[PDB]
Swiss-Prot record, chains A, B:
Belongs to the FAM10 family. One HIP oligomer binds the ATPase domains of at least two HSC70 molecules dependent on activation of the HSC70 ATPase by HSP40. Stabilizes the ADP state of HSC70 that has a high affinity for substrate protein. Through its own chaperone activity, it may contribute to the interaction of HSC70 with various target proteins. Homotetramer. Interacts with HSC70 as well as DNAJ homologs and HSP90. Interacts (via the C-terminus 302- 318 AA) with GRK5. This is Hsc70-interacting protein. It comes from the Eukaryota. It is found in: Cytoplasm.
Amino acid sequence: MDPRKVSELRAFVKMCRQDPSVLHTEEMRFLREWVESMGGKVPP
Amino acid sequence: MDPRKVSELRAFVKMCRQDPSVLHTEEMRFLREWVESMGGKVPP
């Protein structure tokens, strides 16, 4: 992927690690499902 | 989000599903670490 979008993804992950709120929306269900497919659990 | 960036993230997840090796690089270590923090593991 292009380096700017990677930087945006780093910023997104940094946000989620401090406040995973956005992940609990319907918009982000696909992302939760992907994490779950890898054996993870999105925390509260 | 920017709906366009949600779209890009969906496309990125699709790409990673199709070819998990995209996540194996040092550039993507931050993403592996995030997944591991949630108890998952990126596929081989």
